[PDB]
Amino acid sequence: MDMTVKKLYFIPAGRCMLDHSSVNSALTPGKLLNLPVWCYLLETEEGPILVDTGMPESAVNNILPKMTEEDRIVNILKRVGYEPDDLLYIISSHLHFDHAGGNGAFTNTPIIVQRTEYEAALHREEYMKECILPHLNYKIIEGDYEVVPGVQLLYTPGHSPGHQSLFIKTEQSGSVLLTIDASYTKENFEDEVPFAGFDPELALSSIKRLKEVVKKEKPIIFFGHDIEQEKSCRVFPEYI
Ligand SMILES: [Zn+2]
Ligand SMILES: [Zn+2]
């Protein structure tokens, strides 16, 4: 039997303001939403694994990032009690600025990223250099992938060219699906309400596949940028 994740920690990593049409493509532009940015820390038998790394330090006190010094991944690292080199793996759901802005902090740890995301970040205009530094220890994968027992990546392209979501089994909670940006909000997922993405058609098929996973596994699901779900989540220092 595969080991489960001992602890899954949800870690607030600042906020980002967007037009409300980002979460529902049918909404009339001109109203702001202030969305939560997340990273997640997984304590496993082989060691700690970090999913996403927050926003670039250039966003501190500066799409409108709402980021303070506290939200920098290394200050997050300080609060969880780890140095960058303690991490077994970094997992990048994708290389958008609110998910990979802290990547440069990890220069030894393998950073798991989808080939289509990595290759897109080398060429596409929307990618900030902070998110695609050339000499990090990239572990480039393609498609679904087991990172360690209890931690699996589901390839969910659409929102970005190589976006990936997480399927985890934890000791306390059992099966957990972290959609990340494969669905910002519950309704993007359940009701297939269209939202901001590189390839909405592909995003929809990725949602459909996640639905097949949900039918089989009946996991608890946590969405990428959901202000309604946000405050009822147990967050660091609590875990699930
Ligand atoms: Zn994104
Ligand atoms: Zn995002």
- Measure 98 CA to ligand 2 centroid, in angstroms: 6
Dist. CA 196–CA 34, nearest whole Å: 15
Distance 45 CA to ligand 2 centre (A): 29
Single-letter code of the amino acid located at 41: L
CA of 181 to the centre of ligand 1 (A): 5
Experimental method: X-ray
DSSP code string of the chain? -PPPBSEEEEEEEEEEEEEGGGT-TTSPS--EEEEEEEEEEEEETTEEEEE---S-GGGBT--EEEB-GGGSHHHHHHHHT--GGG-SEEE-S--SHHHHTTGGG-SSS-EEEEHHHHHHHTT-TT--GGGS-TTS-EEEE-SSEEEETTEEEEE--SSSTT-EEEEEEETTTEEEEEEETT-SSHHHHHS------S-HHHHHHHHHHHHHHHHHH--EEEESS-HHHHTTS--TTS--
Q: How is domain 1-231 classified at the CATH fold level?
A: Metallo-beta-lactamase; Chain A (3.60.15)
Q: With contact defined as beta carbons under 8 Å apart, do 201 and 211 qualify?
A: no
Cβ neighbour number for residue 79 with a 10 Å cutoff = 12
Asked, as a colleague might, if the bond just before 12 is cis with ω within 30 of 0, I would say no
Q: Is 214 exposed, middle or buried (0-12, 13-18, 19+ CB in 10 A)?
A: middle
Phi and psi (nearest 5°) for 207? Answer: -60, -45
Binding positions are: 94, 96, 98-99, 159, 181, 225
Q: How far is the CA of 24 from the centre of ligand 2 (A)?
A: 14
Resolution in A: 1.7
Count of residues for the chain? 240
Report the DSSP beta bridge partners of residue 139: 112
Ligand 2 geometric centre to CA of 200 (Å):
15
Is the CA virtual torsion 224, 132, 33, 207 positive or negative?
Answer: negative
- Are 34 and 15 within 8 A, CB to CB? yes
Which contacts qualify for 20-24: CB closer than 8 Å, 24 or more apart? 21/196, 22/184, 22/195, 22/196, 23/184, 23/185, 23/188, 23/193, 23/195, 23/196, 23/225, 24/187, 24/188, 24/193, 24/194, 24/195
